[PDB]
Paper text:
CE clan proteases, specific hydrolases for ubiquitin-like modifications (SUMO and NEDD8) in eukaryotes, reportedly serve as bacterial effector proteins with deSUMOylase, deubiquitinase, or, even, acetyltransferase activities. Here, we characterize bacterial CE protease activities, revealing K63-linkage-specific deubiquitinases in human pathogens, such as Salmonella, Escherichia, and Shigella, as well as ubiquitin/ubiquitin-like cross-reactive enzymes in Chlamydia, Rickettsia, and Xanthomonas.
We determined high-resolution crystal structures of the CE clan effectors SseL, RickCE, and ChlaDUB1. To this, we added entirely uncharacterized CE clan proteins RickCE (Rickettsia bellii, GenBank: ABE04279.1), LegCE (Legionella pneumophila ssp. pneumophila, GenBank: AAU28953.1), and ShiCE (Shigella flexneri; GenBank: EGK20985.1). Interestingly, the remaining bacterial effectors SseL, ElaD, and ShiCE are Ub-specific proteases, and ChlaDUB1 and RickCE cleave both Ub- and, to a lesser extent, NEDD8-modified peptides.
Numbering used by the authors: 423 to 682
Write the structure that this text describes.
Amino acid sequence: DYWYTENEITHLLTAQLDEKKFSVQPAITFRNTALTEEMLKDYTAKGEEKNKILAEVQETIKIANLIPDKEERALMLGDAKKREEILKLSDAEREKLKNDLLRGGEAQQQINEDILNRATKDIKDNGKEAAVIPIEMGYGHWTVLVAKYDKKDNQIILTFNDSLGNSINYDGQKLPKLIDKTLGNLPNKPIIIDEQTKQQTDQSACGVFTVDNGIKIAKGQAILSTEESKGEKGLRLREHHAQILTDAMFKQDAQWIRQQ
C-alpha cells in the first residue's frame, strides 16, 4: 500500500533514467531469516524426533495465542499452525517441500550473483555510466546499490544507501558477502562507498528514497541529507512519484497513494 514493490521502484527508475547511459537492474533480494539444520528438521525428522517437534508446535500454538500484540500474535500463530500442517504431511512430501525450499534459496543466490555480474558487464563492456540495483534486505526493506566503473584505473565502484540509517552491513554482512563472492576475484577489488545517510525511519519510506537515491547516485549528485529528509520530504517525493507514475501507469500511483 504505502510500501513500494519492486514494480514501482523499477518503473520510477526507468522513467527517470536515460537507458542509453544507465541500466536499471532487477532487484537483488535477500531473505531476512537464516536457514538452519534445526529448522529443516520440520521436514526431515521422523518417528520420535518428529513426535517431539509436533508436540512443541502444538504447545506454541497454545501460547502464541496469548501474545498481547495483535499483529505479532497473528504472525507467530499463523506460522505455528503452518508448521503443524507440515509436520502432519507424509515423510515423502515433507522431503519435497524441503527440496523446494533449498532449490529456491539456491536460485535466489545465483540470480543475485547474476544481477551483480550483469550490472558489472553493463558498465565495463556496454558503455553504461551507471548500473542501478534495487536491494531488498528483507520484506519491503528497500535499499539501493549503484555500480560505476573507472576505466582509467580499471576500478569498479559500488555506492550504497539505506534510508532507514543502517549501514551496508545490515543483517550479518549479507550484501558485502555477496559482493565479495561475486566480484572479489577482479583484478582490482570493488571499492565500496556507503553513504550511510539516515533519511527516514519509516519502513514505508524505503522505496521512496531508494528511487531518489538511486537516481541521484547514478547521476553523480548528492543524495538528500539527513537534514533535508526531515519533515514531509518523503511525502512530497511520494506525491511526485505518483505523478511520474500517473504520467504512464495509473494503478501504481493509486498503490503508492493508499494509507496502510
